[PDB]
Design a protein around this ligand. Structure first.
Ligand SMILES: Cc1cc2nc3c(=O)[nH]c(=O)nc-3n(C[C@H](O)[C@H](O)[C@H](O)COP(=O)(O)O)c2cc1C
Ligand SMILES: Cc1cc2nc3c(=O)[nH]c(=O)nc-3n(C[C@H](O)[C@H](O)[C@H](O)COP(=O)(O)O)c2cc1C
Lengths: 200, 200
């Protein structure tokens, strides 16, 4: 596809504080491409943060060269093929000396400005918090939106509500976590309203 | 907000065989507005199908006057408020002899062309023709859960070794149901690959 060059992330309509599901493309020093789904937190007009688990090709590539592209797509097969295994050589395109996803609705180049270790606890792992600056922002005519799970978590909770015991509370809890993790104040307020109606 | 008029559903990039999550606005004889989330199956350039469970105001209104609008929004509080209770009067607007959702990114008028009663619960299958298609500048996409069903399945997949096979089995089963019901060939194929990978 053909890309139009834009100044920054506002052309992708990314909003400060939201986490976007994206395909992150990285490469080793032989320029062998790697792709994987990674959440990308928008922190400002031209900055993002990534939270990267240890021992993946994504983190090792990124810590080795400080470079990556973030790629917007809504194709479930790209998310699937880059999770179950590796994308084929032909899924990688060059842009200057960055690689990106062939056929991405939008991508931006990114350079690492800081990295920080971080203990994660849920249900203990150590992660890298990688803050980056966006360089060139490339948008195709096929771009519509960057994928965000906030609206989906509210929708799944409403559907569960319409059919409302331990599983339900559990579903509502997973969805609330997702909404707080990735969403904005409207999503979080939606979740509050739903939990309120469930308590009643 | 301002709308542009369009001929058919292609303007909203709805695809045949996909189910969209929308707000359906209906009204009684006194033109009292009702809004509720309803799935809308796109069946062609200007046709849709709705599946309407018994005993809602939505079905009562639609079977009574054979008219409604389908309204595109991604606002989580609108889905939430119209599920938990009722939208207030200022949430309805006029278009010709139809009501629509005030502030919708897009809406279309629809006229019932046939209805069929299905049998536990009673269900009405309502086929309708799309009339005027009205698109605002804020329009990006109509909401569809297919990509989210894949996304949820892939996260569950990456967490496979760390959770109990039973909840995992059930979550994949349910995301499979969603992709089947709402999704296109790519989402269905994605789910097929995921389930296969889990079985290996
Ligand atoms: C939708 C989704 C979101 C994900 N987000 C992250 C994330 O933000 N950070 C991370 O380290 N891994 C994340 N992952 C998991 C990685 O994609 C997964 O570990 C992948 O196998 C890494 O492969 P790699 O070794 O090629 O880098 C995510 C996976 C999915 C399916
Ligand atoms: C995301 C979502 C999709 C829904 N889809 C349908 C559907 O297609 N058909 C239906 O009968 N009800 C559907 N519902 C449930 C109704 O919205 C719900 O019963 C609502 O309370 C009806 O309100 P009413 O009495 O104003 O019509 C859906 C609910 C949600 C949250």
């Amino acid at each position: 596809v053909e890309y139009t060059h834009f100044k920054d992330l506002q052309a992708l309509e990314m909003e400060r504080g939201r986490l976007y599901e994206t395909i992150v493309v990285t490469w080793d020093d032989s320029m062998v491409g790697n792709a994987a789904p990674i959440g990308v937190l928008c922190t400002g007009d031209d900055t993002v943060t990534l939270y990267l688990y240890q021992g993946t090709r994504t983190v090792e590539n990124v810590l080795n060269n400080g470079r990556f592209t973030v790629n917007v797509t809504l194709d479930p097969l790209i998310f699937t093929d880059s999770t179950l295994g590796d994308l084929e050589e032909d899924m990688f395109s060059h842009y200057r000396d960055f690689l990106h996803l062939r056929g991405a609705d939008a991508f931006f180049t990114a350079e690492v400005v800081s990295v920080k270790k971080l203990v994660k606890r849920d249900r203990e792992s150590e992660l890298h918090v990688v803050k980056a600056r966006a360089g060139d922002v490339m948008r195709a005519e096929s771009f519509r939106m960057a994928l965000n799970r906030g609206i989906y978590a509210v929708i799944e909770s409403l559907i569960a509500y319409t059919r409302a015991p331990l599983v339900l509370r559990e579903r509502i809890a997973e969805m609330n976590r997702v909404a707080r993790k990735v969403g904005g104040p409207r999503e979080k307020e939606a979740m509050r309203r739903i939990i309120q109606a469930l308590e009643s």
